[PDB]
Design a protein around this ligand. Structure first.
Ligand SMILES: *[C@@H]1O[C@H](CO)[C@@H](O)[C@H](O)[C@H]1NC(C)=O
Ligand SMILES: *[C@@H]1O[C@H](CO)[C@@H](O)[C@H](O)[C@H]1NC(C)=O
Ligand SMILES: *[C@@H]1O[C@H](CO)[C@@H](O)[C@H](O)[C@H]1NC(C)=O
Ligand SMILES: *[C@@H]1O[C@H](CO)[C@@H](O)[C@H](O)[C@H]1NC(C)=O
Ligand SMILES: *[C@@H]1O[C@H](CO)[C@@H](O)[C@H](O)[C@H]1NC(C)=O
Ligand SMILES: *[C@@H]1O[C@H](CO)[C@@H](O)[C@H](O)[C@H]1NC(C)=O
Ligand SMILES: N[C@@H](CCC(=O)O)C(=O)O
Ligand SMILES: [Cl-]
Ligand SMILES: [Cl-]
Ligand code: NA
Lengths: 189, 342
């Protein structure tokens, strides 16, 4: 997955999330065209594959011909009542895309973090199964403690949790941020 | 601190060169869609492990004149010959030609550009054709991905051909060139999207997928269509509206998380002390757990009836019912959240 966010001078916007699924997709590159082919079929459920201990397959997401597999992607645009864009946001990184996008929104809209902080702020993830909360290395350890005393099992992410690109409207114009976790920076005028 | 504020326009992509390419498209009079496409073509090079013309995408697009949002669905589809029991292991579903779904990326760019383009199609490719030929230093993200998959890359000559220097994966800062893809981008620029789906690239695409054990056919490519969704999912959040894609993407999950949480009236005060902050983050995690319980009912709405599921996932009342089951002093076992498969 990769996410990018765009706001043009007339106020129109695009939030786009694109993917070949796992890193380097199917690992099939064409020696002639250079195209690297997706492994999106992996995002279907299959009766014969168990991915997580004790978790059954999901029939709603089985393979049929012509069907699209479920995706964690969620490119979002938030628009104010006056018709102006407020936020353009989305994320990359697998199952943690949806939670990371939620967090970036919560951080900016409710906690009052500016867009760069909303992007850089430590994240956490829980998807019910596995039955664990993953937290990034630099999260406030008072949060880790508050989770653990409420009987969450926490574990620290070996690398990082998701990648967020975002733009927010401010009094000064359009504030943009790309996520240091993957190394991007925005551009504008 | 690393802030970036722009008086007129902005592109936030995951590589600076691609953000610059999008920004230049805007400055040259392109629409937001033109800029997005130009930047996407570049990200497919600079973060080639992540996305590209061999994959698929969704675009959420807002027109500030009409004040309408739309979604373009260009996610890959299972080939015509696919079937429910085609894989017996995760490895089979993840590696090789059989793991490949029909790419939607280029027909997604085409539809978006037909509806919202200002710059010529070929102009969108030009910067990336140069970049692919000139080469670029491998960035942080691609470098870590190469390291992560070093074994599979180094053992596959067709991958090592571009992603290695002297038989070992490229490291951060080392130059990556993508000369074959540059020529493919040039062909797409000149001949259009039709080249991919029903033109000069098509037979070779099929040959490549089938040679690696896949089942995509020319008919699959010819028949692929990106879809316009005139009524994306939305939720109200205060005085704002949030537009996001429904199933088969995760808009319904995001909607449910946010609708659960909005009833707590979070503010800066929610994170002002360890006590408040701890409860706040617990509530967030519990909202995630409830939302993921419901996610297992989702699938492609052309094939599965998710109407009522999505209705609930986007309903404030349903969210309030779940919020009421969040305990401030404890989390719960899996069954508490009522995960559902049927
Ligand atoms: C998995 O097993 C089924 C049932 O025999 C078979 O139809 C299918 O071809 C198998 N898949 C692979 C990749 O071997
Ligand atoms: C936005 O909507 C207006 C009004 O219908 C239309 O003229 C214009 O072409 C649209 N812009 C884009 C970039 O699609
Ligand atoms: C193009 O499409 C037509 C029908 O849609 C088909 O007869 C023809 O073989 C296709 N050509 C390629 C190169 O796919
Ligand atoms: C949000 O909910 C549905 C989307 O289909 C629709 O009835 C309503 O008009 C939408 N609101 C906006 C502002 O688009
Ligand atoms: C929607 O939620 C209600 C509770 O508010 C529940 O009774 C109903 O079964 C749900 N619908 C589906 C399809 O799960
Ligand atoms: C999951 O974690 C919770 C929290 O400690 C615990 O109560 C439960 O027993 C665990 N296992 C399952 C299957 O829910
Ligand atoms: N390709 C990973 C997804 O769509 O979620
Ligand atoms: Cl990204
Ligand atoms: Cl190449
Ligand atoms: Na920034």
């Amino acid at each position: 997955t990769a996410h990018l966010s765009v706001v043009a001078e007339d106020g129109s916007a695009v939030s786009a999330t694109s993917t070949i699924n796992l890193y380097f997709g199917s690992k099939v590159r064409s020696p002639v065209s250079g195209i690297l082919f997706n492994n999106e079929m992996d995002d279907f459920s299959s009766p014969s594959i168990t991915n997580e201990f004790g978790v059954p397959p999901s029939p709603a997401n089985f393979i049929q011909p012509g069907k699209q597999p479920l995706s964690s992607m969620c490119p979002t645009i938030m628009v104010g009542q006056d018709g102006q864009v407020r936020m353009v946001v989305g994320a990359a990184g697998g199952t943690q895309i949806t939670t990371a996008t939620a967090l970036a929104i919560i951080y900016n809209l409710w906690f009052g973090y500016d867009v760069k902080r909303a992007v850089e702020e430590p994240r956490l993830h829980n998807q019910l199964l596995p039955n664990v909360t993953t937290v990034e290395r630099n999260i406030d350890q008072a949060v880790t403690a508050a989770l653990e005393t409420r009987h969450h099992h926490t574990q620290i992410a070996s690398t990082f949790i998701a990648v967020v690109q975002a733009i927010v409207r401010t009094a000064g114009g359009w504030a943009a941020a790309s996520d240091s976790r993957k190394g991007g920076e925005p551009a504008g005028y | 601190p690393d802030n970036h504020v722009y008086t007129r326009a902005a592109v936030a992509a995951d590589a600076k060169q691609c953000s610059k390419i999008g920004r230049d498209a805007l400055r040259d009079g392109g629409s937001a869609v033109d800029a997005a496409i130009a930047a996407l073509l570049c990200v497919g090079l600079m973060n080639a492990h992540s996305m590209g013309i061999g994959g698929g995408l969704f675009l959420t697009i807002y027109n500030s004149t009409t004040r309408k949002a739309e979604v373009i669905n260009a996610r890959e589809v299972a080939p015509r010959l696919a079937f429910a029991t085609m894989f017996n292991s995760s490895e089979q579903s993840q590696k090789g030609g059989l793991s490949v779904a029909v790419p939607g990326e280029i027909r997604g760019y085409e539809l978006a550009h037909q509806r919202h383009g200002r710059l010529p199609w070929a102009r969108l490719f030009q910067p990336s054709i140069q970049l692919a030929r000139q080469g670029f230093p491998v960035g942080k993200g691609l470098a870590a991905a190469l390291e992560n998959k070093r074994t599979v890359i180094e053992q596959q000559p067709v991958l090592c051909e571009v992603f290695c220097r002297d038989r070992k994966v490229l490291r951060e800062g080392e130059r990556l060139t993508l000369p074959q893809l540059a020529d493919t981008y040039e062909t797409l620029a000149i001949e259009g999207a039709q080249a991919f789906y029903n033109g000069s690239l098509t037979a070779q695409i099929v040959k490549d997928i089938q040679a690696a054990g896949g089942i995509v056919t020319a008919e699959d490519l010819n028949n692929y269509r990106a879809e316009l969704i005139e009524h994306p999912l939305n939720i109200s959040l205060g005085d704002a509206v949030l537009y996001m894609p429904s199933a088969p993407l995760s808009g319904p999950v995001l909607a449910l998380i946010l609708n659960i949480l909005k009833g707590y009236n979070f503010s800066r005060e929610s994170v002002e002390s360890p006590e408040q902050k701890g409860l706040t983050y617990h509530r967030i995690v519990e909202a995630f757990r409830f939302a993921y319980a419901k996610r297992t009912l989702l699938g492609d709405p052309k094939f599965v009836d998710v109407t009522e599921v999505v209705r609930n996932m986007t309903s404030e009342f349903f969210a309030a019912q779940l919020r009421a089951q969040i305990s401030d002093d404890t989390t719960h076992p899996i069954s508490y959240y009522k995960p559902e498969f049927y």
